[PDB]
Write a protein that binds this ligand. Structure first.
Ligand SMILES: NC(=[NH2+])NCCC[C@H](N)C(=O)O
Ligand SMILES: NC(=[NH2+])NCCC[C@H](N)C(=O)O
Lengths: 215, 240, 215, 240
């Protein structure tokens, strides 16, 4: 045919529905990823070499390897074990596990980023590593980490579209549905990309108007 | 009180200290001078173990502190350190900056700690700034605040690592004045500085370092009018 | 069943074949992405106000929106126009178009990273903007951009796995090919992730031995 | 020759110059001093338009250069600038640093440019360094190199923006000496500096600035020994 966006108006509740799942997926994965990411960071800080080794290897592998292959490894790879996990839980697991590795590194880099003089002064005042960390360094790293976390979210918004291929009804999946009743792929994809763009801009501006409510 | 004994320091291939010995007794004001790459600041930072000797030993109050057989926090409680770039805690206010360590390390109580803090703030001329945050202070106020903070831990010696060399010229005197007041009150001080006036005015000894070694020491008038060694003379001719 | 990797040895030529396709896909996509990216950066620098708008809008959209949606928009969205482009040309176009925008930002940022003093000195000696750029700034921006380009490649290697969903015979697709004859998903996915990982490490340490041969 | 005419400069709400006027003629050595926030560097940088006045005008050689109606590159060809944090081109060797602009800007020929350069390297004591890259030079060597580079365009006036204040103390004299040699040869100079000895030994005028305005000017001796203004005396008391 030729382009016809006005046909697409009928499918607004689908577009809207897909969007809400894209939010819900991301928000839950990144939330779990943060908590997981936290705990994995701590393990790498451990003085006990085998635990630091495991956290390091986890992080290195999850980051050094594609999100897709992680998704599929959970979803398809587990079938032959009599394990049939739903699309939503598979995507949440994959995304939270991917995000956890990137988050652990965000934390480590936020701590390395506070000026080493702070620690020096703190310890020079009779403080132990523990106290210095509690009262001087960590609060400061926090301000380094929070805006990078908010950015991790925004990136994960785009990243979550990958669970479409698993048959999860996210925003991107709505184009396979619409075409089935319209035979049109083009217009709903343009529309979907536009929803992604608007989400990206909105959350970015919300993010920058938060780095200025810190500085 | 302080005995740095033949220490060496490496940073990879970079040899910074090449066998340095330093003795300072209670109540001396010792000033260490030299060009960049002399090693004077690394020597300074060996005293409270912000830097670790590759070889040789450092003793404070007669006990060795670079062998792992000592509580180092308890050591740093005695040995104050004042930094070139001020190292004020940004998230804490002036008075909070001052009271943090006494409360948390000495288990002093908020009231006693605050009274200590306001006394020190009065002493270095910062009372009107007690509830201000570092970002709001000038360079001179910053360094005077950091000095207040170190004093709040009542150390037995104070180390100064170029405390005025990051300050604007109109700001140097006030920091140097607080330092001279400390010297006049008997505080034991090791000061690494470019400001030779401080040494002339208040110093007991001057140490001249060059290429990781002490090449000459003596009283300030001995070094500034009668330096015996050629390197001391070259450096002083460029710097005086 | 239970795990059996040793069965997988027989399928070594598949894994290898896929690996070479992911390389060919990426190397070619990023190469075009660089050329395109340069041109779009240059375009954004232009004094002609509508053109800067075009380059800016392009970059903003390509980056603020998912790679997947761009892929599908090319492969599926163009079908209803009587255009059936192959999986490979679709994947290369999608990846090079994505890469073009990210490269366009890398370049601009490598120019912004050279110390403004260089330019000031340059102009203060009578040099024009053109001469300063030509003889002083650009040679220095280059050393900023190359290690970021090298890293863009490494990232796209992981990204290219997305053309699996389109049926391109890349490294990831080989797990769908192997399982159809083995009924096993897990082991070929593990193997694939191991291959992606080793690629990441190899190119990364190879990248570090070049971030040390420039500066 | 140089006429800065009642200029103002703002950076947003930050008022840096608040009505400043400066005239300097051929052969003068003018020295501008003051505390941080005096505006002296922003004034200096208006003269070759590295900074643009919010209001007011700057004329060089009698023609207005901040009206958009002038080739500013040819203006900057005449007005040299030496920077505090030396702005050497890292990818270029010493002599390359020097010859880049004469060859590219004046279309001077390679051989002639190289002779100019070796003469200048010889003059500032860097002849042995002609094929060295900036990385391998000390601060003093860097600033001397940068001065050679500015000289190779043979400007009619030379601007100095705190040329030694990023140098180690034992590095200061050798740079000031090159500056003084320039003064002795009649070069027109505007120098923003902390080194009052220079201003005394070789300055024809000393300008004292404070809070974005000139508050007093006179000969070096008038300012340093007989300053009439309260603020001038106060500043000099902290700094001298
Ligand atoms: N949590 C994240 N930010 N993950 C980024 C994933 C990057 C890329 N899409 C990959 O598959 O590796
Ligand atoms: N050329 C790149 N590095 N692209 C990164 C893409 C990030 C993410 N996978 C997305 O689809 O938005």
């Amino acid at each position: 045919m030729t382009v016809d966006f006005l046909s697409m108006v009928k499918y607004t509740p689908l577009f809207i529905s897909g969007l809400i799942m894209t939010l819900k997926l991301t928000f839950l994965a990144v939330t779990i990823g943060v908590l997981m990411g936290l705990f994995i960071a701590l393990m790498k800080m451990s003085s006990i070499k085998p635990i630091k080794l495991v956290a390091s290897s986890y992080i290195e592998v999850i980051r050094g390897t594609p999100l897709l292959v992680q998704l599929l490894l959970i979803y398809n790879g587990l079938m032959q074990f009599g394990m049939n996990i739903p699309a939503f839980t598979a995507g949440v697991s994959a995304l939270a596990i991917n995000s956890s590795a990137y988050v652990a590194e965000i934390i480590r880099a936020g701590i390395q980023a506070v000026d080493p003089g702070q620690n020096e002064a703190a310890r020079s005042l009779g403080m132990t590593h523990a106290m210095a960390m509690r009262y001087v360094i960590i609060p400061q790293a926090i301000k380094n980490i929070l805006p990078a976390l908010g950015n991790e979210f925004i990136v994960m918004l785009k990243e979550s579209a990958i669970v479409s291929v698993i048959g999860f009804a996210d925003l991107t999946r709505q184009a396979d549905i619409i075409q089935s009743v319209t035979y049109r792929y083009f217009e709903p994809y343009i529309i979907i990309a536009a929803i992604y763009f608007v989400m990206t801009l909105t959350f970015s501006k919300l993010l920058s108007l938060f780095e200025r409510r810190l500085r | 009180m302080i005995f740095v004994n033949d220490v060496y320091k490496n940073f990879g291939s970079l040899e910074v200290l090449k066998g340095v010995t330093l003795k300072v007794n209670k109540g001396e004001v010792v000033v260490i001078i030299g060009p960049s790459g002399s090693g004077k600041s690394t020597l300074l930072r060996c005293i409270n173990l912000l830097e670790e000797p590759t070889k040789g030993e450092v003793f404070i109050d007669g006990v060795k502190i670079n062998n792992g057989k000592v509580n180092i926090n308890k050591v740093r409680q005695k040995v104050g350190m004042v930094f070139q770039h001020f190292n004020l805690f940004p998230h804490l206010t002036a008075i909070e900056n001052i009271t943090l360590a006494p409360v948390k390390v000495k288990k002093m109580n908020k009231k006693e700690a605050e009274e200590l803090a306001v006394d020190l703030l009065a002493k270095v001329g910062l009372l009107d700034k007690k509830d201000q945050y570092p970002i709001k202070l000038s360079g001179g106020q910053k360094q005077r605040l950091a000095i207040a903070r170190a004093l709040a831990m009542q150390p037995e010696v104070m180390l100064f690592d170029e405390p005025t060399s990051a300050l604007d010229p109109e700001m140097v005197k006030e920091v140097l004045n607080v330092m001279k007041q400390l010297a006049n009150e008997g505080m034991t001080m090791v000061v690494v500085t470019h400001e030779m006036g401080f040494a002339r005015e208040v110093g007991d000894r001057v140490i001249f370092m060059d290429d990781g070694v002490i090449v000459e020491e003596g009283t300030p008038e001995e070094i500034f009018y009668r330096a015996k060694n050629e390197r001391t003379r070259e450096f002083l001719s460029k710097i005086l």
